[PDB]
């Protein structure tokens, strides 16, 4: 066939590129950062009415000041989360302080390229790249509220807002215009909830979509249906208002 | 201290006319404390008998090991192992643990099914084979047993006579050893049949 | 470096065949004829010494090998494969038997060991099966005399008489006629020489033929005296001279 | 490097099938037929010797019936070499169980182990599977007489009557036709020989082409007995049953 | 060192001294012998400072991971076993720690586990650990009842450490108190023995021995 | 040491185990249950080194339970004890051996008979009418050697223990804080909650 | 030694070996699970390609991981064994370390991880298995039902089915199961399950096994009759129309 | 042709080429331009940072390896992290064991040999990143150009990345001038910004778009970003 770490004639790693494709098929996920906190939203996407929608976990906590959303082959993210949590807790044990959001991200990204059938650099044991992207969101005293996009490539970027998944290209286009440096947490919630509605095949309700945020005061929380549903409503009204 | 002196017990084998005998006491104590008077130290695989004195845990372990090995041996060879061969197997098995041996004093007795010749052998804890034509002694009362045998024994005894002789050697030796006794058992082995008897002895 | 060939080189084809084994067998067919005959008091194994150059000294090369003092082997197929097989066979008879029980292994069991070695080269990673078939002939106290055939697959079977290699089909037929359960060793040796003749093109003498037997014990071949139960090896390779003397009454 | 020559023996087909397991089975289908019939008072194993000859020694021969335990035995269909490798690990497994618990190994426990070993060569290792199918015939005090079957895949199942190797479809049909729950060992013995006799690719079902074994509870004792028939014993039973 | 923890009608009381000794030398009188694993979990220290302090901190980390993993607070029983099993891994290597793992969970209620480097793990209502244990037991055993006002129990605990600090040469400095309810643990101050002794003496009339 | 007693009567096995847990100068607990149920009809009592004691018991427990689930069957008492001996026998030659002694009391639902197994840290196994680990033996072995019958009832048996426990409270140097008794029989395992005055 | 990357990405972002693993599942006999208000039931069909087996000893389809949790599956049998073993082992381990049996969700998460792991490790192929795991968490009466697949993905269901013709029986269940009101009775819950299987088993009371799990390690498998009876009372329901 | 010899790095093409290395080499050309130049007193790095959206950040291009050494990357960001981390260890090792600052010439030899290992052994892949290393050691100021093929070269100045040929010509022209900008960092940096601008096209260099680093005589290697580089735009 061809090595799992072969370069294309264009200078790209085939497996990583293909990895990116599987992610495009993933369920939408959006992250918006405001000086009041960061909001993470995701499309549940139950493949059947019998599937208890709340057993769909695509937004998890890394630490009290760091949470993250995923898109793509979600089973692949379990070990990434484990590593991330372990890194976070560990930094605290060794330094008696919280892990910086960016470092936490950098750590996760370092596992990224650890694949191959025998790459001359260490002992990269993992037969293929991960098939999932992550939106890591949190806050730390050094750089306040932050939002990171981490990919199977090992690279990561910082965004004011970012959408990954099936409707990304379109939703990102919206975010490009919608986002402004003075957004409020409230505004960001509706904005996320709105864009999710536009890209979702399903009629966005409080069962096929989930919200969550991270604030210096209360840390990472995942909005419970009742809370999100009322935000849904609050949105319909404002829209139907003009 | 001496592992071979924790539990106590003795075994002794003898050759007679077209027969072999092997006996043992039934004691299993912990130092001075007598614990069991039902600890037989004689086992057999097919027509080959094996007595084992020493540390109880190893006595048990070795029996379970030789059963395992003799069973596979039969499945592959398609015949039961003979005394001579088994002696070799016992010897190599022990020497394999040369620098961390089992604390046992193995004794083999049996009749070569193909030659009908009586056979007995003793081994030190690392396999040194002692193949005697008259008798083999083992256990915490081995000195006494040597004394008994060297005097009482005489060639080609008939089964009924060999039984008296081996039983008297065992009995009187055990009575001079604080760690042996509490009942004995004796096996008289002939080509055709094998008889097992429990002796009546002091219980102190 | 490091052998990265940790996968099987012999696999199942859609038809259920194991190619490499089939091919190995083919290599055996192309090999020089060799045969075995079991009598009531001995076994004989022989083959033709196909010297590959008039300058080569055929004595310096034996196709008939002693494995234990009562077991010998002969083959058909790849000479070098056979050679290393013989070394392994002699060693396994020790490490896996004599060193445990203090006595040489009985024929069926040693054969069983050799067979395994071949089976493994059929499934292990990075290797090809052995390109040979063997004929083991030996004797043990509880099984008497025996003759075995071991194939590249690792399969083996007991024989009253058989042949492998080039003219096996023909040789086998000639043996099925002449064999009976009353043959004495000398008779088998004779049948042997006759059977081999057909399969031999040109020269046929004690220098182009190689034959050994498993028969009575040879105290004279022991090398020492003083131990009653040690009566001598049953395996004996006939000499060029012994072979010719027989060919005269052929 | 090596990748170029890697057959990749452990992968799924687009249909979700294991190529090698399938092909291994394909190989087994050409092996001498083996039949296992379980009765109320015993079990029966019968197998047809593939490839025979005037010169083939039969008293010394064994190629399909192997004793694993004192209460367990198997009938082989496929690569003998491969089978032996497994058979020996099986004999060891039984002895270990015995050493650990001082009790003879329960039949299914032995079968699951062997099946597991096979299953492994199916999921990892890059090696080929064993081209073997076993019919297990054994007895224990928890399920009495049992008859099992395992193949290259690593799956096993229980049976009242079963065949493996060549012409199984034919053989299975015939057994499905005359097998009855209340059968007796000798009944089973006959049904076995008859089935083979009907599926045989040979002219006649002679003894020199058979291997036979029975696990019967010799009434005059109270214990179970394993018996692999000798050439003559098969020759006899072959006459009585009416095949002469 | 003297540490005690006991269950009563109002939850759990935990009291410790604060003296560290290197032989007969008094290294410190201000050591925190209570590790706050979390809002509902406390650990006491006895034996080697480094050993306890280090491994109990490590325990906190292990508990936190459990909660992130399982989305739920770890049980007192489980927290104590993490420590118990870890410590058992090092059995014979020289670790020295007499520890108490105390907490309150809805499912277990008030719970106290004693864990030492021996590999010993025990659940109980009362436990006194350290060189001053016997002294604390003397006072505690003969004044303990299941019905003690959260305020009386608090004092009994404090008084028991006081007894130990007095008699034991290795115990002293100050007393650190804690109360554990299902709502979590509540810190009830640091009481220096320097002032506490005289106060208690005068007010209670005890220690009548000492010359005042 | 701790008191570990076992006596096999007619249709059951009774295990008595001291409740005290002492560390040096202080008795830390008086209600300690030195036992683990390996299977519904198999109970194991233990005594020995501080850590190894429970670590070993729970380890054995886990395995016997795993075997039960996998086979949907309960191994005979004999089999369970053989497994335990093998484990201790391995331990004795390991880097750091388990310093644990145990009594295994079980009811063989098949043979329909009670069984008592004594096994020390060396892997020494013996089956007895009654047994004990530690010093207890030195007192009880002759008490039972005297007042013991094969056909005794569970009730008679419990009285025989009462006899033993009394002698132990009279002559033993330590205060083992009484024992916890348990009965294993055709119906399983139960505790005699009223022995502190039975 | 052998570490070839057997599960890898293809141009369209697919991992064929994992997908082909699912195909193996689709070909497996049907399995279904429905949770009532106080119990969960698991049903499985028995192939008939060959019939002359010994049902006493032939390994059944519903396996106990612990006393309060069971697991059924669709796909390769040999594969399922390895997963069931690992699970049973983890079960005992969890009891030993946390001094508490596993929750159904935990056990499920474990198994799912093992499956996921085999999709990105060299030298191995994914499990040609998909599972249904159900039971009651220790000291909890809320029935639990989860499903896992080769990819390593899992989630809970009110009712679900896997294996051949699962598409069909799922339909039946989607228009026969009301979350609003779950089968309040063990009996009515076991009926719904048999009904759903009858859509695909095509009359086979001997080809349909059931297992009822109740709170507090109360697990029991019904007999042919007990089952055969539900088959009967159900076939009449039809005729009576 | 090529298609039969580019499946790995353990294969030579009929003409003696190593395609996998060449493809890796391509990843660099596709990367954002970066420049390096040095006088006798200082060495300077100037890099154009690239972003994804306008809602994203600009990926860092300069990494510090020690107080006297640092580099700029073009290509696979991860690989640059790997290699720069390796360079940090080597610098660190030289200090801890010998109490010696790792010479730039030596650092270069190390990188070369580390890279080479992933071009002759099956399983490994070449690194997909180019590096420009500057440092001040016992022989003064230095500038190195590192290629994934393992070829490391010492130059007065150079550039790598898309449209890099622009700046490289400029420097190759300015040479005699900037190599003498001793004792005046701000001038060398300006010469550096003028060099890099010769590779612009899309836009012009802004504040959160430009990145500059410098090391010299009494100047510990330091990076400038944002407003810090404003005074040069
Ligand atoms: C509780 C008192 C005790 O329970 N036991 C007396 C032993 C005291 C231990 C501890 N003090 C120390 O551990 C001192 N450090 C120390 O001894 N280090 C060792 C060394 O030899 O240097 C190392 C571990 C080999 C120091 C930290 C004061 C102490 O005061 N124990 C108290 C309480 C738990 C602090």
> Does the CB of A1 have a partner CB in chain D at under 8 Å?
yes
Number of E/G CB contacts below 8 angstroms equals 17
Contact of G209 with G63, CB cutoff 8 Å:
no
* E132 alpha carbon – ligand 1 mean position (Å): 14
Closest listed residue to residue C246, CA positions, set C62, C35, C44, C66: C44
Pocket perturbation via mutation, ligand 1, pick of E18, E20, E33 by most ligand atoms within 8 A of CB = E20
Contacts of B124 (CB under 8 A, 6+ apart): B105, B130
Contact of B180 with B140, CB cutoff 8 Å:
yes
* Tokens of residue A33, six digits: 């950062």
Q: Ligand 1, atom 3: nearest CA belongs to which residue?
A: E47
- Give the three-state DSSP class for H103: coil
Cα separation, D38 vs D181, in Å, equals 9
Q: Ligand 1, atom 15: nearest CA belongs to which residue?
A: E22
Closest listed residue to residue A133, CA positions, set A14, A30, A10, A39: A30
Q: Rg of chain G over CA atoms, in angstroms?
A: 18
Resolution of this PDB entry, in A? 2.9
Within 10 A of F34 (CB to CB), how many other CB atoms are there? 25
Q: Is the CB of E164 under 6 A from ligand 1?
A: no
Contact of E96 with E73, CB cutoff 8 Å:
no
Within 10 A of D140 (CB to CB), how many other CB atoms are there? 20
Are residues A55 and G4, on separate chains, in Cβ contact within 8 Å?
no
Find tokens 């139907």 and name the residue.
A240
Contacts of H118 (CB under 8 A, 6+ apart): A119, A120, A121, H9, H124, H125, H126, H127
Q: Is the CB of E12 under 6 A from ligand 1?
A: no
Cα separation, C26 vs C30, in Å, equals 7
Which backbone phi and psi does C203 adopt, to 5 degrees?
-60, 140
Angle at CA of residue E141, ends E137 and E145, nearest 5°: 145
Binding site of E for bortezomib, by residue number, is: 49
Contact of C160 with C40, CB cutoff 8 Å:
no
Domain region containing B78: 1-204
- Find, in chain D, the residue whose alpha carbon is nearest to that of C13: D23
* E32 alpha carbon – ligand 1 mean position (Å): 13
Are residues C15 and D82, on separate chains, in Cβ contact within 8 Å?
no
> Does the CB of H123 have a partner CB in chain A at under 8 Å?
yes
**Chain F residues near residue E119 by CB distance under 8 angstroms:** 50-52, 54-55
**Chain F residues near residue G67 by CB distance under 8 angstroms:** 69
CATH 3.40.640.10 fits D1-244, yes or no: no
Q: State CA C140 to chain mean position distance.
A: 17
Homologous superfamily, domain C1-250: Aminohydrolase, N-terminal nucleophile (Ntn) domain (3.60.20.10)
Q: Is the CB of E27 under 6 A from ligand 1?
A: yes
Q: Helix, strand, coil: what percent of chain D each, to 5?
A: 35, 25, 35
Q: Ligand 1, atom 30: nearest CA belongs to which residue?
A: E20
Residues of A with CB under 8 A from a CB of E: 61-63, 82, 85-86, 89-90, 92-93
CATH 3.60.20.10 fits A1-242, yes or no: yes
Within 10 A of A194 (CB to CB), how many other CB atoms are there? 20
Q: How was this structure determined?
A: X-ray
Distance between start and end Cα atoms, chain A:
57
Q: Is the CB of E170 under 6 A from ligand 1?
A: yes
Q: Is the CB of E119 under 6 A from ligand 1?
A: no
Where in chain C are the domains? 1-250
Find tokens 């419970």 and name the residue.
A224
Report the largest interatomic distance among the alpha carbons of chain C, rounded to a whole angstrom.
63
**Chain E residues near residue A82 by CB distance under 8 angstroms:** 69
Q: CB-hemisphere CA count at 13 Å for B69?
A: 19
Cα separation, H41 vs B27, in Å, equals 95
Q: Ligand 1, atom 14: nearest CA belongs to which residue?
A: E22
* Rounded (10°) angle between helices A101-112 and A78-95: 130
Contact of B175 with B181, CB cutoff 8 Å:
yes
The C-alpha of D205 sits at a distance from chain A's nearest C-alpha, in angstroms, of 51
Which helix (H) or strand (E) element contains residue B15? strand B10-16
* E135 alpha carbon – ligand 1 mean position (Å): 20
Are residues A7 and H82, on separate chains, in Cβ contact within 8 Å?
no
Q: CB-hemisphere CA count at 13 Å for E167?
A: 18
Find chains touching chain D: ≥3 CB pairs under 8 Å: A, B, C, F, G, H
> Does the CB of G22 have a partner CB in chain D at under 8 Å?
yes
Residues of E carrying an active site annotation: 1
Strands F26-29 and F21-23: antiparallel
Dihedral-angle region of residue H35 (phi above 0 means left; psi in -120 to 50 means alpha; beta otherwise): beta
Closest listed residue to residue E153, CA positions, set E161, E143, E163: E143
Torsion of CA E130, E134, E136, E142, to 10 degrees: 150
Closest listed residue to residue H74, CA positions, set H61, H83, H64: H61
- Find, in chain F, the residue whose alpha carbon is nearest to that of E81: F55
H107 by Cβ neighbours in 10 Å (0-12 / 13-18 / 19+) ranks as: buried
Please report the atom of ligand 1 found closest to the CA of residue E45.
34
Q: State CA E105 to chain mean position distance.
A: 18
What single-letter DSSP state applies at residue C132? E
Contact of H70 with H63, CB cutoff 8 Å:
yes
**Chain A residues near residue E60 by CB distance under 8 angstroms:** 93
Q: Ligand 1, atom 19: nearest CA belongs to which residue?
A: E48
Within 10 A of D203 (CB to CB), how many other CB atoms are there? 6
Cα separation, C66 vs C61, in Å, equals 13
Q: Which among A2, A119, A176 has the least Cβ separation from residue H7?
A: A2
Are residues D100 and F76, on separate chains, in Cβ contact within 8 Å?
no
**Chain F residues near residue D100 by CB distance under 8 angstroms:** 82-83, 86
Contact of H65 with H87, CB cutoff 8 Å:
yes
Beta bridge partners of B138: B11
Q: Is the CB of E165 under 6 A from ligand 1?
A: no
Q: Is the CB of E31 under 6 A from ligand 1?
A: yes
Contact of B73 with B28, CB cutoff 8 Å:
no
Q: Which among C100, C109, C112 has the least Cβ separation from residue B89?
A: C100
> Does the CB of D197 have a partner CB in chain C at under 8 Å?
no
Q: Is the CB of E211 under 6 A from ligand 1?
A: no
Please report the atom of ligand 1 found closest to the CA of residue E17.
33
* Tokens of residue G202, six digits: 């095509």
CA torsion sign, F133 to F134 to F140 to F142? Answer: positive
Contacts of D214 (CB under 8 A, 6+ apart): D42, D43, D44, D45, D185, D189, D226, D227, D229
Q: Is the CB of E21 under 6 A from ligand 1?
A: yes
Q: What is the secondary structure of B91-121 as a DSSP string?
A: HHHHHTTTTS---EEEEEEEE-TTT--EEEE
Q: Helix, strand, coil: what percent of chain G each, to 5?
A: 35, 25, 40
Cα separation, E93 vs E87, in Å, equals 10
Contact of C169 with C147, CB cutoff 8 Å:
no
Contacts of D49 (CB under 8 A, 6+ apart): D32, D61, D63, D64, D208, D209, D210, D211
**Chain E residues near residue A86 by CB distance under 8 angstroms:** 65
CA torsion sign, H219 to H225 to H230 to H232? Answer: positive
Q: Is the CB of E50 under 6 A from ligand 1?
A: yes
Beta bridge partners of C39: C42
Q: What is the secondary structure of chain A as a DSSP string?
A: ---TTPBPTTS-BHHHHHHHHHHHTSPPEEEEEETTEEEEEEE---SSTTB-GGG---EEEEETTEEEEEEESGGGGHHHHHHHHHHHHHHHHHHSSPPPHHHHHHHHHHHHT--BSS-TTS---BSS--SEEEEEEEEETTTEEEEEEE-TTS-EEE-SEEEESTTHHHHHHHHHHH--TT--HHHHHHHHHHHHHHH-SS---SSSEEEEEEETTTEEEE--HHHHHHHHHHHHHHHHT-
Find tokens 């058989």 and name the residue.
C162
Q: Ligand 1, atom 25: nearest CA belongs to which residue?
A: E48
Q: CB-hemisphere CA count at 13 Å for H26?
A: 13
| CATH level 2 (architecture), domain H1-233 | 4-Layer Sandwich (3.60)
Cα separation, H113 vs H193, in Å, equals 32
Contacts of D29 (CB under 8 A, 6+ apart): C16, D165, D166, D168
Beta strand spans in chain G (E) = 31-35, 40-45, 63-66, 69-75, 129-135, 144-148, 154-156, 159-162, 208-214, 218-221
Contact of C199 with C166, CB cutoff 8 Å:
yes
Please report the atom of ligand 1 found closest to the CA of residue E28.
28
**Chain A residues near residue H55 by CB distance under 8 angstroms:** 159-162, 172, 175-176, 179
* Tokens of residue E47, six digits: 């034996």
* F95 alpha carbon – ligand 1 mean position (Å): 29
Chains B and C touch (3+ CB pairs under 8 A): yes
Give how far Cα B137 sits from Cα of B31, B52, B120, B146, D93, Å: 21, 10, 10, 7, 36
Cα separation, A183 vs A35, in Å, equals 8
**Chain B residues near residue F89 by CB distance under 8 angstroms:** 57, 60-61
Q: Ligand 1, atom 4: nearest CA belongs to which residue?
A: E47
Are residues F70 and G88, on separate chains, in Cβ contact within 8 Å?
yes
- Find, in chain D, the residue whose alpha carbon is nearest to that of B70: D95
In CATH, what number is assigned to the domain containing residue E168? 3.60.20.10
Q: Is the CB of E48 under 6 A from ligand 1?
A: yes
Q: What is the secondary structure of G182-200 as a DSSP string?
A: ---SHHHHHHHHHHHHHHH
- Give the three-state DSSP class for H204: coil
Contact of C171 with C160, CB cutoff 8 Å:
no
Within 10 A of D145 (CB to CB), how many other CB atoms are there? 23
């Amino acid at each position: 066939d061809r090595g799992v770490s072969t370069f294309s004639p264009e200078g790209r790693l085939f497996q990583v590129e293909y990895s990116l494709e599987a992610i495009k098929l993933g369920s939408t996920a959006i992250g918006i950062a405001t000086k009041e906190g960061v909001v993470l939203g995701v499309e549940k996407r139950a493949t059947s009415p019998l599937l208890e929608s709340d057993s769909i976990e695509k937004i998890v906590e890394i630490d009290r000041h760091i949470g993250c959303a995923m898109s793509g082959l979600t089973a692949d993210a379990r070990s990434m989360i484990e590593h991330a949590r372990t890194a976070a807790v560990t930094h605290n044990l060794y330094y008696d302080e919280d892990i910086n959001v960016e470092s936490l991200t950098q750590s996760v990204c370092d596992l990224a390229l650890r694949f191959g059938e025998g790459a001359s650099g260490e002992e990269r044991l993992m037969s293929r790249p991960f098939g999932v992207a992550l939106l890591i969101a949190g806050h730390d005293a050094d750089d306040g509220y932050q939002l990171f996009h981490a990919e199977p490539s090992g690279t990561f970027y910082r965004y004011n807002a970012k959408a990954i998944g099936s409707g990304s290209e379109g939703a990102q286009a919206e975010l490009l215009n919608e986002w402004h440096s003075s957004l409020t947490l409230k505004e960001a919630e509706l904005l996320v909830l709105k864009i999710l509605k536009q890209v979702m095949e399903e009629k966005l309700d409080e069962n096929n979509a989930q919200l969550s945020c991270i604030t210096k005061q209360d840390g990472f929380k995942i909005y419970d249906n009742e809370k999100t549903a009322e935000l849904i409503k609050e949105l319909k009204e404002k829209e139907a208002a003009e | 201290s001496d592992p071979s002196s924790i539990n106590g017990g003795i075994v002794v084998a003898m050759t007679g006319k077209d027969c072999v005998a092997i006996a043992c006491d039934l004691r299993l104590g912990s130092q001075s404390l007598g614990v069991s008077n039902k600890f037989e130290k004689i086992f057999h695989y097919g027509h080959v008998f094996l007595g084992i004195t020493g540390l109880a845990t190893d006595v048990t372990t070795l029996n379970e090991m030789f059963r395992y090995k003799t069973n596979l041996y039969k499945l592959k060879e398609e015949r039961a192992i003979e005394p001579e061969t088994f002696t070799q197997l016992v010897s190599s098995s022990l020497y394999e643990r040369r620098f961390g041996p089992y604390f046992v004093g193995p004794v083999v007795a049996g009749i070569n099914s193909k030659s009908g010749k009586p056979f007995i052998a003793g081994f030190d804890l690392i396999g040194c084979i002692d193949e005697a034509k008259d008798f083999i002694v083992s256990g915490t009362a081995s000195d006494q047993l040597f004394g008994m045998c060297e005097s009482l024994y005489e060639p080609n005894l008939e089964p009924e006579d060999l039984f008296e002789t081996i039983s008297q050697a065992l009995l009187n030796a055990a009575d001079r050893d604080a760690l042996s006794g509490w009942g004995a058992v004796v096996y008289i082995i002939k080509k055709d049949e094998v008889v097992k008897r429990y002796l009546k002895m002091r219980q102190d | 470096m490091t052998d990265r060939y940790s996968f099987s080189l012999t696999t199942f084809s859609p038809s259920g065949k194991l190619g490499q084994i089939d091919y190995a067998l083919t290599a055996v067919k192309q090999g020089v004829t060799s045969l075995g005959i079991k009598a009531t008091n001995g076994v004989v194994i022989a083959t033709e010494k196909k010297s590959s150059s008039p300058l080569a000294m055929s004595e310096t090369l034996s196709k008939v090998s002693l494995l234990t003092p009562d077991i010998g082997a002969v083959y058909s197929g790849m000479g070098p494969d056979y050679r290393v097989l013989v070394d392994k066979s002699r060693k396994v008879a020790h490490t896996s038997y004599k060193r445990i029980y203090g006595e040489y292994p009985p024929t069926k069991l040693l054969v069983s060991e050799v067979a395994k070695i071949m089976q493994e080269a059929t499934q292990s990673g990075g290797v090809r099966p052995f390109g040979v078939s063997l004929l083991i002939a030996g004797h043990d106290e509880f099984n008497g005399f025996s003759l075995y055939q071991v194939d590249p697959s690792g399969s083996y079977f007991p024989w009253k008489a058989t042949a492998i290699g080039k003219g096996s089909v023909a040789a086998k037929t000639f043996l099925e006629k002449r064999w009976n359960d009353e043959l004495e060793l000398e008779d088998a040796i004779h049948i042997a020489l006759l059977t081999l003749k057909e399969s031999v093109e040109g020269e046929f003498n004690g220098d182009t033929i190689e034959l050994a037997i498993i028969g009575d014990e040879n105290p004279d071949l022991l090398g020492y005296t003083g131990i009653p139960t040690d009566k001598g090896p049953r395996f004996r390779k006939l000499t060029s001279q012994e072979i010719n003397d027989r060919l005269e009454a052929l | 490097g090596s990748r170029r020559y890697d057959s990749r023996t452990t992968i799924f087909s687009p249909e979700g099938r294991l190529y090698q397991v399938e092909y291994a089975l394909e190989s087994i289908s050409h092996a001498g037929t083996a039949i296992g019939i379980m009765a109320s008072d015993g079990i029966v194993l019968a197998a047809e010797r593939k490839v025979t000859s005037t010169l083939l020694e039969q008293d010394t021969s064994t190629e399909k019936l192997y004793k694993l335990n004192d209460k367990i035995a198997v009938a082989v269909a496929g690569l003998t070499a491969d089978a032996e490798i497994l058979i020996n690990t099986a004999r060891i497994h039984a002895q270990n169980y015995l050493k650990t618990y001082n009790e003879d190994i329960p039949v299914e426990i032995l079968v699951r182990r062997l099946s597991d070993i096979k299953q492994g060569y199916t999921q990892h290792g890059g090696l080929r599977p064993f081209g073997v199918s076993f019919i297990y015939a054994g007895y224990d005090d928890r399920y009495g007489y049992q008859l099992y079957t395992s193949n290259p895949s690593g799956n096993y199942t229980g049976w009242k009557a079963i065949s493996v190797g060549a012409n199984t479809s034919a053989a299975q049909t015939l057994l499905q036709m005359d097998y009855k729950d209340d059968m007796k060992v000798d009944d089973a013995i006959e049904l076995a020989l008859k089935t083979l006799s009907k599926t045989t690719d040979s002219s006649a079902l002679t003894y020199d082409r058979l291997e036979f074994a029975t696990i019967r509870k010799g009434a005059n004792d109270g214990e179970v007995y394993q018996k692999i028939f000798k050439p003559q014993e098969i020759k006899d039973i072959l006459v009585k049953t009416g095949i002469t | 060192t003297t540490t005690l923890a006991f269950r009563f009608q109002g939850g759990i009381i935990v009291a410790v001294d604060s003296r560290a000794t290197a032989g007969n030398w008094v290294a410190s009188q201000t050591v925190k012998k209570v590790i706050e694993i979390n809002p509902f979990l406390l650990g006491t220290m006895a034996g080697g400072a480094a050993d306890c302090q280090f491994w109990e901190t490590w325990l906190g980390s292990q508990c936190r991971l459990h909660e992130l993993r399982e989305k739920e607070r770890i049980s007192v029983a489980a927290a104590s076993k993490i420590l118990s099993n870890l410590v058992y891994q090092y059995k014979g290597a020289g670790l020295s720690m007499g520890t108490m793992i105390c907490g309150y969970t809805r499912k277990e209620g008030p719970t106290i586990y004693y864990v030492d480097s021996d590999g010993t793990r025990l659940k109980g209502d009362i436990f006194c650990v350290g060189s001053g244990q016997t002294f604390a037991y003397g006072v505690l055993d003969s004044n303990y009842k299941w019905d003690l006002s959260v305020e009386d129990a608090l004092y009994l605990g404090k008084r028991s450490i006081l007894a130990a600090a007095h008699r034991d040469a290795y115990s002293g400095g100050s007393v650190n108190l804690y109360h554990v309810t299902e709502d979590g643990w509540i810190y009830h101050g640091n009481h220096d023995v320097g002032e506490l002794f005289w106060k208690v003496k005068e007010e209670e009339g005890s220690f009548n021995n000492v010359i005042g | 040491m701790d008191i570990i007693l076992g006596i096999r009567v007619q249709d059951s096995v009774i295990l008595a185990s001291s409740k005290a847990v002492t560390r040096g100068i202080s008795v830390l607990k008086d209600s300690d249950d030195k036992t683990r149920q390996l299977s519904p009809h198999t109970l194991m009592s233990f005594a020995g080194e501080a850590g190894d004691t429970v670590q070993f018991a729970e380890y054995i427990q886990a395995n016997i339970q795993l075997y039960s689930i996998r086979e949907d069957y309960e191994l005979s008492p004999q089999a369970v004890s053989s497994f335990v001996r093998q484990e201790l026998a391995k331990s004795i030659r390991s880097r750091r051996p388990y310093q644990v002694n145990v009594l295994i009391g079980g009811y063989d639902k098949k043979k329909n008979k009670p069984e008592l197994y004594q096994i020390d840290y060396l892997g020494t196994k013996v089956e007895l009418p009654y047994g004990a680990h530690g010093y207890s033996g030195f007192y009880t072995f002759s008490l039972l050697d005297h007042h013991y019958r094969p056909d005794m009832t569970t009730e008679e048996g419990l009285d025989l223990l009462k006899l033993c426990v009394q002698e132990l409270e009279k002559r033993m140097p330590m205060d083992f804080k009484g024992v916890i008794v348990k009965i294993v029989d055709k119906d399983g395992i139960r505790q005699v909650d009223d022995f502190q005055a039975q | 030694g052998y570490d070839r990357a057997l599960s890898i990405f293809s141009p369209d972002g697919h991992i064929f070996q994992v997908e082909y693993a699912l195909e193996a599942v689709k070909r497996g006999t049907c399995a279904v699970g429905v949770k009532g208000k106080n119990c969960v039931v698991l049903g499985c069909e028995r192939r008939s390609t060959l019939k002359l087996q010994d049902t006493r000893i032939t390994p059944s389809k519903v396996s106990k991981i612990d006393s309060h949790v069971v697991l059924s599956f669709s796909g390769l049998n040999a594969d399922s064994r390895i997963l069931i073993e690992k699970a049973r082992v983890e079960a005992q381990s969890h009891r030993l370390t946390l001094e508490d049996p596993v929750t159904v969700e935990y056990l499920t998460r474990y198994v799912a991880g093992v499956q996921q792991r085999y999709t990105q490790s060299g030298g191995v192929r994914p499990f040609g298995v998909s599972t249904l795991i159900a039971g009651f968490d220790p000291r909890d009466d809320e029935p639990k039902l989860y499903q896992t697949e080769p990819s390593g993905i899992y989630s809970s269901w009110s009712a679900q089915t896997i294996g051949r013709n699962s598409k069909t029986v799922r339909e039946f269940l989607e228009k026969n199961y009301d979350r609003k009101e779950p089968p309040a009775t063990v009996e009515e819950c076991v009926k719904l399950t048999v009904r759903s299987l009858l859509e695909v088993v095509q009359t086979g009371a001997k080809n349909i096994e059931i297992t009822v799990v109740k709170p507090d390690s109360d697990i029991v498998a019904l007999s042919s009759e007990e089952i055969n009876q539900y088959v009967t009372q159900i076939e009449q329901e039809k005729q009576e129309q | 042709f090529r298609n039969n010899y580019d499946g790995d790095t353990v294969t030579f093409s009929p003409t003696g080429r190593l395609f996998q290395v060449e493809y890796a080499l391509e990843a660099i050309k596709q990367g954002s331009v970066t420049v390096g130049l040095r006088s006798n007193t200082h060495a300077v790095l100037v890099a154009l940072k690239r972003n994804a959206d306008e809602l994203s950040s600009y990926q860092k291009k300069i990494i510090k390896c020690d107080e006297h050494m640092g580099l700029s990357l073009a290509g696979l960001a991860p690989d640059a992290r790997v290699l720069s981390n390796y360079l940090r260890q080597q610098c660190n090792y030289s200090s801890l064991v010998f109490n010696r600052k790792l010479a730039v010439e030596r650092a270069g030899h190390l990188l070369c040999d580390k890279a080479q290992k992933n071009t002759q052994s099956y399983g490994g892949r070449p690194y997909g990143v180019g590096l420009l290393i500057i440092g001040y050691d016992k022989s003064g100021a230095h500038l190195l150009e590192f290629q994934p093929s393992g070829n490391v070269t010492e130059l007065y100045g150079t550039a790598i990345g898309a449209r890099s040929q622009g700046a490289k010509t400029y420097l190759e022209r300015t040479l005699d001038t900037f190599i003498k900008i001793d004792g005046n960092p701000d001038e060398l940096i300006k010469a550096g910004v003028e060099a890099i601008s010769q590779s612009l096209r899309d836009e012009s260099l802004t504040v959160d778009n430009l990145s500059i680093a410098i090391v010299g005589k009494d100047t510990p290697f330091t990076i400038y970003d944002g407003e810090a580089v404003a005074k040069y735009i």
